[PDB]
Amino acid sequence: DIQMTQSPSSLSASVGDRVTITCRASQSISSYLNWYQQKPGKAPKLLIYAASSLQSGVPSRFSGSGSGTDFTLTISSLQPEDFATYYCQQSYSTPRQWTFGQGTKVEIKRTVAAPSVFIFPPSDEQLKSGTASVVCLLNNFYPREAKVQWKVDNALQSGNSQESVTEQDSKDSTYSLSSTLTLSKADYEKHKVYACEVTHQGLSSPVTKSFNRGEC
Amino acid sequence: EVQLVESGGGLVQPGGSLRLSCAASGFTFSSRNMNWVRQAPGKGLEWVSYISSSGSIYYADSVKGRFSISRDNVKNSLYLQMNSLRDEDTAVYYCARGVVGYYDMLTGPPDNWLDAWGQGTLVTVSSASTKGPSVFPLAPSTAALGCLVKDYFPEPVTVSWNSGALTSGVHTFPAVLQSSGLYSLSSVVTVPSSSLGTQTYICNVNHKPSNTKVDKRVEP
Amino acid sequence: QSVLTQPPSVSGAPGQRVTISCTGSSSNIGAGYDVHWYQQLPGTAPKLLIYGNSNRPSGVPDRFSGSKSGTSASLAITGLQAEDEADYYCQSYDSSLSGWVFGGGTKLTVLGQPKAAPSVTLFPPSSEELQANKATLVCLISDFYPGAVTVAWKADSSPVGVETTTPSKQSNNKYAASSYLSLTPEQWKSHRSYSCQVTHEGSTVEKTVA
Amino acid sequence: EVQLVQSGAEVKKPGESLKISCQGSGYSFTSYWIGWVRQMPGKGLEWMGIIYPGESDTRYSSSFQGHVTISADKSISTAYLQWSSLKASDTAMYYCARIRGVYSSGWIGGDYWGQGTLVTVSSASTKGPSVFPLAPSSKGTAALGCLVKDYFPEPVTVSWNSGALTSGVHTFPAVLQSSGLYSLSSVVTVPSSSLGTQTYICNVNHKPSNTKVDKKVEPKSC
Amino acid sequence: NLCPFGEVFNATRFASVYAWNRKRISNCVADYSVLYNSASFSTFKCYGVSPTKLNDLCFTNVYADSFVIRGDEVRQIAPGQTGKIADYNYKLPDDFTGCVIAWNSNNLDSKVGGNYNYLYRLFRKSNLKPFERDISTEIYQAGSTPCNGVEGFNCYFPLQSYGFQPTNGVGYQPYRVVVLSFELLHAPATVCGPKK
Ligand SMILES: *[C@@H]1O[C@H](CO[C@@H]2O[C@@H](C)[C@@H](O)[C@@H](O)[C@@H]2O)[C@@H](O[C@@H]2O[C@H](CO)[C@@H](O[C@@H]3O[C@H](CO)[C@@H](O)[C@H](O)[C@@H]3O)[C@H](O)[C@H]2NC(C)=O)[C@H](O)[C@H]1NC(C)=O
């Protein structure tokens, strides 16, 4: 078994930057290293083979170097098309023991943007169906890291929430997040105050957006 | 078919020199690498020299400075010149054909597996001089009676029993080579003890180089 | 002392399979250097049976086979036949020696005629030779198969310059060997006990005179 | 062109049997090795195995040997991946890739790849989406949305005002609930002045259930 | 117009020695440098030509013969050698001008459970002429009684499979062999080394 370890796991870069990604092997794989590019919802594409040989249709800005245990893929001038996840794979071994790296995600660097926080109360039509969904939205925020907390009558909630995060927006290079709290109608009637507390680098203080079922 | 003939062997004194020649037929001699390999009497094979088609030469450390290898492609012959001969050099020397010569980009020793071997030439190196056999019989104690020869050079020696009438029961045991280069042999005859009381046994031993013929009587 | 070490003797009756081993060193086998196997019938020039560690030359029976593991290499003979009886040698290249190395050699006998054990008749020195002031002792070994033996000379229960003959084949097709080691001074009188020891198929036969 | 076309997406229940296909065009199918790669949800690529078509050589990855069968038909230039008994962990994307070839003592990676086939294995039977409004708040930019809940299987496609509204629209990735039913949210940012004067309708289509729902999202009335 | 040596050497699939492949190389410029620069090859032995200086000579035609054999049997692919592969599969001329090149292929041509696709001929009535191929499947009569289409004692199928396993030793491991034949005839030289 040969282990392929890729550094970094993630990087954020601007167009025109030089990007360097390293793949390391547990034992020597000689020249049989392959570099792949994959984009969300799309199949992997083979950029490089033999550690330095470019597949047809791959621009010269992509370059490959390295031997034995250590290999490196470099993009000389980063391009809008080049923001994607990149993988390294070994072909030295028998097909049985072929292995891939964990991959490096290349993302667009952006100035910090605070999340815009919105809370949507449960709809009455869903309440008739017997379930209550409360939604908190963090909109157009960079960086990706954000902490969302659901407080019901100022009581912390755990295990009742699910989160989804958007991929970076094409126009603005920001992320949007949705947190949904699913409760019973009976528990929804039981408690007055539903609050979403948001922590992000752009916000100096956590921002809480809340609604009172009784007050409104 | 392939014929390899070796010549030039003989009995020579230590510190002597001699030339061995191998004549090759039935194959293209120039293309083949050639080797010299020696086998001491009752002993294993030892590689002595190698000559390539190109003329690259490798020698064993034991023979270095005393033995040289040569080839003549017109005469299709291999030659080994031997100087400062020693008793350890005594052996049967074999002409050996190696693989077809090649140029190797890669490093490493040449391929040398010996498909073709000559019948060989025996080379004997000894400081010994001709010596008459000294005969001492071995007395009985069926009974076994025999005759012993000590410190004799060189073989052949012939032993006969009771003028040769007694053929059955008589074994001529192998000669031994001593550090001196002298040879010792025994001949043993097995016959009834009842015969021993009533039958005389006389052994006749002849050494032609010594020109000494002796008759020995063995009795209890 | 041979760089490649082989078993001295191997025995098998017809139709059996026997193995001959060539032990090695970091210099020769186990450096990857090839091993070649040669068969020599008595009184004949050596003949190539295996080359390139496994390849069999044309006209060499399929029963002969070659394999190598680590320092060691082995030749396998299957369906043993009387013609197969020979002395077998292994060849390799040694980097330290900068030359090709041969093994000491192995004697293989198809068992054929029944196994037999050495018969020994040690002889004390003759008085006429004693009158000569020399002393000679002859250990005579007869009618043994395989004809491969080890001879050790014992004086006064002590291990003992000794010279011993190569095994020889008698008319019976049994073998005979001879040891004539003879010391005149300071021990034949000193020792009133003497013996010669022969080992054959793990058996030691002793004849004592002094 | 060299084209690898994979079979359409598959949804199956646990313990069932599945065979998926990749058809090759523009190259000699017999000349090039063809293999299968699994991408588990939110995970990296894994090689399952390869097959050389027409010489009956199938080489499996260590991980997947004995759990899957890889086959090929040279007559239709197609390759197949088969699961004897489907399991929930088998749910993943599955890709067909052609190995470019070999050089010296080693292999080369896959130059050409298929579009991919999504295999979902679940106890859940197919269910239509329920669309619930995420109303704009009576608070200069306001957020409105639609919540699509309790639908199986994926995909669900969401539009706003029949494609007139694309700006400010984020349609979130679906999440899998303990029910085995997926839920998704689509939200759009609009001018606050717009809420009274503009009608915003979310159009949600689920092909598996043949379900289309258009939901008006309107400011709540107090 | 560089000679297409990569197609022979870097080919995904190699032929069995009984059905060995021959590719003509012609009307091209040959850089033998790729071959001598490489550290890839376990055997690079040239007969009648030096491994170096091939570029300075010009050859009317070049032939590349490719097959897969076990490593020890690379010793059989030489002028004047004898054995099953030389006698019944691929025979090199005594007057051979060309190069024999071989490299280990275990990761490429070995699989767990064995690869039995590569094959060799154990028996033939006569030893093969130089550069001759036999793809026959006829049963071989090694005995006095005719086979009559049935395998048995002294009646054998001509072909057998190498069993190539990663666990196997290097001598029994798969090795890929290219033999380059350089020919001189009374013709203008299609293949020339780059220097001349
Ligand atoms: C078989 O293929 C290898 C690998 O080459 C790559 O894969 C093939 C399938 C083709 O698509 C190639 O186009 C592709 O690059 C070939 O090995 C390569 O050979 C070249 C030339 O000898 C090497 O370049 C040289 O490197 C040396 C050392 O630095 C320099 O001195 C030279 O100036 C020159 O740059 C190259 O490094 C080497 N690559 C590898 C990974 O080994 C091989 O030549 C080919 N076989 C044949 C017969 O053509």
XYZ file of C-alpha atoms in Angstrom, chain B residues 10-11 37-46 86-94 121-126 175-178 183, chain C residues 40 43-44 87 89 104 107 163-168:
45
model
C 52.797 -32.915 -19.582
C 54.691 -33.693 -16.417
C 39.045 -23.896 -16.600
C 41.107 -26.383 -14.584
C 40.179 -29.388 -12.437
C 42.724 -30.841 -10.023
C 42.719 -34.659 -9.756
C 39.790 -35.840 -7.666
C 38.805 -32.196 -7.129
C 36.404 -29.525 -8.351
C 36.427 -27.107 -11.264
C 38.282 -23.788 -11.070
C 53.620 -24.828 -8.841
C 52.398 -28.160 -7.501
C 48.980 -26.575 -6.918
C 48.836 -25.835 -10.663
C 48.695 -29.603 -11.275
C 45.286 -30.227 -12.848
C 43.437 -31.166 -16.021
C 42.923 -27.980 -18.038
C 39.771 -27.617 -20.147
C 45.059 -31.810 -21.127
C 46.564 -32.987 -17.851
C 49.415 -30.876 -16.475
C 51.392 -32.424 -13.615
C 53.934 -30.400 -11.639
C 56.162 -32.387 -9.292
C 47.894 -45.566 -5.167
C 48.298 -42.536 -2.876
C 50.214 -39.365 -3.737
C 52.253 -37.986 -0.834
C 53.241 -42.959 -4.646
C 30.089 -34.347 -15.213
C 36.068 -39.627 -16.824
C 34.356 -36.977 -18.968
C 29.194 -35.132 -10.183
C 28.785 -28.333 -10.078
C 33.128 -27.982 -4.596
C 28.271 -36.754 -6.170
C 46.824 -38.180 3.100
C 43.833 -40.269 1.972
C 42.778 -41.624 -1.432
C 39.781 -40.551 -3.506
C 36.985 -43.163 -3.597
C 37.494 -45.837 -6.261
